[PDB]
């Protein structure tokens, strides 16, 4: 796992150095950075095409301490066309993303061929100080990645979407 | 010195482990495209010296009594920091 | 040296963290009189050198592959000892 060290205001990748100073666990920091900063498309039809359903892969949750303000967040309440639930319920201790300028709440029906929904690019779904590989029902999340560093010594708008055929190439919104 | 008191020792050790994070991987590191839970194991065979294998089996026999007492004292349902505590104890004892 | 290969980098970083245990507090440290779960965050803005921010975003991109493999190997549902292991590895390597 790569480790970043900030030297003379320049970020470097850790490689024995004998010149880096680490005297406390407060210097170690995990930061969750959103994918919107990288310039990816934040549109709801574009974002939903990066998510897929698979079975046989257990979900995993990692912890981060510092976060980034998100201009776009997503909340999913998706069911099968017969009324049965599609996404798992959020476990105890997992909450929505705290800072979200816009929350895109998407609801409707569509096929769900897997037990859990993953990210096709390998990114994580950021939650309140927790990053998970799967999407939980009715919980606000942001898509992003987590980095580890050695530190040197609010209004939200909700948008409603109605999607049919979620997870396919014939998905109609509103 | 470890003396194997077991009535029978198996000289061969067919082991399964997990791939290291630094191993060579392609597109399978993505959970969506990765293998299932049963396809994440690396197999191998150890036909090395019989003394090492028999001593390893005897060592696990002696560890049972201490491990059982340790688990009884703890209150957490699952324990994952056994090796982390060993590293701290090793480093505290060395003091350099 | 880290080279940012992303098509677009945001020069600004609006971050939220949690108050340190050593910070100045009054009566709010009591959970009964403390703030709700949404009022325990400290905000800030980093308008520092653009190279540090873009390099930080690129570093998180490269960490994804190693982190995904690490999580697959582990069996615990939630992991909180990633930084603790890094400190142990750093201290074991230094040996003083």
């Amino acid at each position, epitope marked *: 796992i790569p480790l970043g060290v900030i030297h003379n205001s320049t970020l470097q*990748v850790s490689d024995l150095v004998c010149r880096d100073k680490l005297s406390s666990t407060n210097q170690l920091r995990s930061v969750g950075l959103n994918l919107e900063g990288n310039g990816v498309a934040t549109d709801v039809p574009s974002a939903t095409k990066r998510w897929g359903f698979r079975s046989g892969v257990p979900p995993k949750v990692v912890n981060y301490e510092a976060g980034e303000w998100a201009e776009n967040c997503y909340n999913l309440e998706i069911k099968k066309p017969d009324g049965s639930e599609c996404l798992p319920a959020a476990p105890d201790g997992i909450r929505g993303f705290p800072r979200c300028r816009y929350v895109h709440k998407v609801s409707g029906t569509g096929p769900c061929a897997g037990d859990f929904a993953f990210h096709k690019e390998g990114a994580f779904f950021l939650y309140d100080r927790l990053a998970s590989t799967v999407i939980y029902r009715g919980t606000t999340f942001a898509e992003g990645v987590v980095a580890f560093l050695i530190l040197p010594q609010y209004y939200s708008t909700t948008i409603r979407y109605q999607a049919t055929g979620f997870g396919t190439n014939e998905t109609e919104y509103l | 010195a470890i003396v194997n008191a077991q009535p029978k020792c198996n000289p061969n050790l067919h082991y399964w482990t997990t791939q290291d994070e630094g191993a*060579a991987i*392609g*597109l*399978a590191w993505i959970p969506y*495209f990765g*293998p299932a839970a049963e396809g994440i194991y690396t197999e191998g065979l150890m036909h090395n010296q019989d003394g090492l294998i028999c001593g390893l089996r005897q060592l696990a026999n002696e560890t049972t009594q201490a491990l059982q007492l340790f688990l009884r004292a703890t209150t957490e349902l699952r324990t994952f920091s056994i090796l982390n505590r060993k590293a701290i104890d090793f480093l505290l004892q060395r003091w350099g | 040296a880290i080279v940012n*290969a992303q098509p677009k980098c945001n020069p600004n970083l609006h971050y939220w963290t949690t108050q340190d245990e050593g910070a100045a507090i009054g009566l709010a440290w009591i959970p009964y009189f403390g703030p709700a779960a949404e009022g325990i965050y400290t905000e800030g803005l980093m308008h520092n050198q653009d190279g540090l921010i873009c390099g930080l975003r690129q570093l998180a991109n490269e960490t994804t592959q190693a982190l995904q493999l690490f999580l697959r190997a582990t069996t615990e549902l939630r992991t909180f000892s990633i930084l603790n292991r890094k400190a142990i590895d750093f201290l074991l390597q230094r040996w003083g």
Partner: single-chain antibody
Amino acid sequence: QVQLQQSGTELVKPGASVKLSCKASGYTFTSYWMHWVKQRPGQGLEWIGEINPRNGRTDFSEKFKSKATLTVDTSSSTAFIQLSSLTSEDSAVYYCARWGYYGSSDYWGQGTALASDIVVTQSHKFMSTSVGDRVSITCKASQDVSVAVAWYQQKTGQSPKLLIYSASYRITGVPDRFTGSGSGTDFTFTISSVQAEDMAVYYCQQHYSTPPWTFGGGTKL
């Protein structure tokens, strides 16, 4: 822009030891694997081995277990391969390529003149065709690879160029006439309209979980 620079043409005695250089720039050197490919004159592409700049982990093919050794220099961001006992059959063009983020040999350097493994086999070797026809190239995999199959195009006198990766995704700048599809064990590479500039040799390589990243047999149009 990712650029890989190698050394010039080197002539050696029938018995000697030689070392080749591969200088890379434009990306984080330690975050990507470095691969070496050997190509005999008039033959296909042979995978030698891979070296990881981080942790120094290295892997080699069965045929090149002892013939080659891989070393890297983090400070200079340069990868070195050392060849011992250069026989008469070692005279070939050697390339160094960068393993992609998802596992594609996207960037190649210019040439330098001197069981448990998944085997990818192409159906044919020569496919004669005319202008305007629709040709299809089939790649077969011994084991199950989900989508991780890449297609490479190599023209006469030029290094191989990546066209399709993940069996569906098209590299930016590649003409839309090139289309790929397939999953599991059968993959197809099709050209909607064959022009006069499409005459080359095409290879398929899988990049799913197998350290022996072997190339295909090739197909000349």
